[PDB]
Design a protein around this ligand. Structure first.
Ligand SMILES: CCNC(=O)c1cn2ncnc(Nc3cc(C(=O)NOC)ccc3C)c2c1C
Length: 333
């Protein structure tokens, strides 16, 4: 039961999409905003770039599609559709993924603007809820930031681009210097930088380079204590820390002047150097800063997700064909 595609040489790249998708307006892939005719609903259409013209892209293509098909949560971007103009696995070299189009990202909401505590509470609460879900399926975002967080006019939020990362202002210090083995709280640190910027209106750690980034982070969290350093195996990481000039951790109360007391408590719990001791998503959800929204019975986790392919070393065409299977087997929500 195929459909009828049309061609749009607009962008500097050719778009070949189904009839229902009209008024393509451009906005690892090029994305267009478009108007779905079948639903009168505005969507986001993504054309994957050279999905199968390199082994890394091939695997990433398969990875992104599996994740989108499996993830069903109100705070995690969902897949409306996936298609290709190709009529056979031999013709397949293009992949399109369609999503809901939201009104704005977080990069603009705080665009030189301070929010209200309730606004912040609600935004951060949804990130944590969507994060708990993703983390439960054993997926980590890795590059969470204002731009991949999509919000609509009613402040309802969805997480974008998770699990692909397998733009320095939101990365955990341990994932930046490559020291102490990282865990899921790497996303918790990003949330910290985002929640802070949401309350203050300014970028928490607005670095100008890798080295200068660690500077700012350490200016606030203070240099790693003996407890942390003793757990750091990397010699190169140890040489760097031991070479820095000692610095005390600041009191977040005298940093986040005026913010709701509990906000500062949650913050302090999120912006910790010790990944071992950083609060988790599920744990941050139970925090009192969220008593108005917290609901232990409406904070779902993900059904088991088979990721074994991650340990696969296949050929481009093997990845290509597996994707083709995911494409044709797709059924809309
Ligand atoms: C607030 C205004 N902006 C938007 O609505 C908006 C802006 N973009 N930009 C890029 N991609 C978007 N969606 C998307 C995300 C993934 C994905 O997340 N796969 O990675 C696991 C896959 C395909 C698509 C189409 C997107 C949306 C929905």
């Amino acid at each position: 039961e195929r459909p009828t595609f049309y061609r749009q040489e607009l962008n500097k790249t050719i778009w070949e999409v189904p009839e229902r998708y009209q008024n393509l307006s451009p906005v690892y892939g090029s994305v267009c905003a478009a108007f779905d005719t079948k639903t009168g609903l505005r969507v986001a259409v993504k054309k994957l770039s050279r999905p199968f013209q390199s082994i890394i892209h091939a695997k990433r293509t398969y990875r992104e599609l599996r994740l989108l098909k499996h993830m069903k949560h109100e705070n995690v971007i969902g897949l409306l559709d996936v298609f290709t103009p190709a009529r056979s696995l031999e013709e397949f070299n293009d992949v399109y993924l369609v999503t809901h189009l939201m009104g704005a990202d977080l990069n603009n909401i705080v665009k030189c603007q301070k929010l209200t505590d309730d606004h912040v509470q609600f935004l951060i609460y949804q990130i944590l809820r969507g994060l708990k879900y993703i983390h439960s399926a054993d997926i980590i975002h890795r590059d969470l930031k204002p731009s991949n967080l999509a919000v609509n006019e009613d402040c309802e939020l969805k997480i974008l681009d998770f699990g692909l990362a397998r733009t320095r202002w939101y990365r955990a210090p341990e994932i930046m210097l490559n020291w102490m083995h990282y865990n899921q709280t790497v996303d918790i640190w990003s949330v910290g930088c985002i929640m802070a910027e949401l309350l203050t209106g300014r970028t928490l750690f607005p670095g100008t380079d890798h080295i200068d980034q660690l500077k700012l982070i350490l200016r606030l969290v203070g240099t790693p204590g003996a407890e942390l350093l003793k757990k750091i195996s990397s010699e190169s990481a140890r040489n760097y820390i031991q070479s820095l000039t000692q610095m005390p951790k600041m009191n977040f109360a005298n940093v986040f002047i005026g913010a709701n007391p509990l906000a500062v408590d949650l913050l302090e719990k999120m912006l910790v150097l010790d990944s071992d001791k950083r609060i988790t998503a599920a744990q941050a959800l139970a925090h009192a800063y969220f008593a108005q929204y917290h609901d232990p019975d409406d904070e779902p986790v993900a059904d088991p997700y088979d990721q074994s392919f991650e340990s696969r070393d296949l050929l481009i065409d093997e990845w290509k064909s597996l994707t083709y299977d995911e494409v044709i087997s797709f059924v809309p929500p």
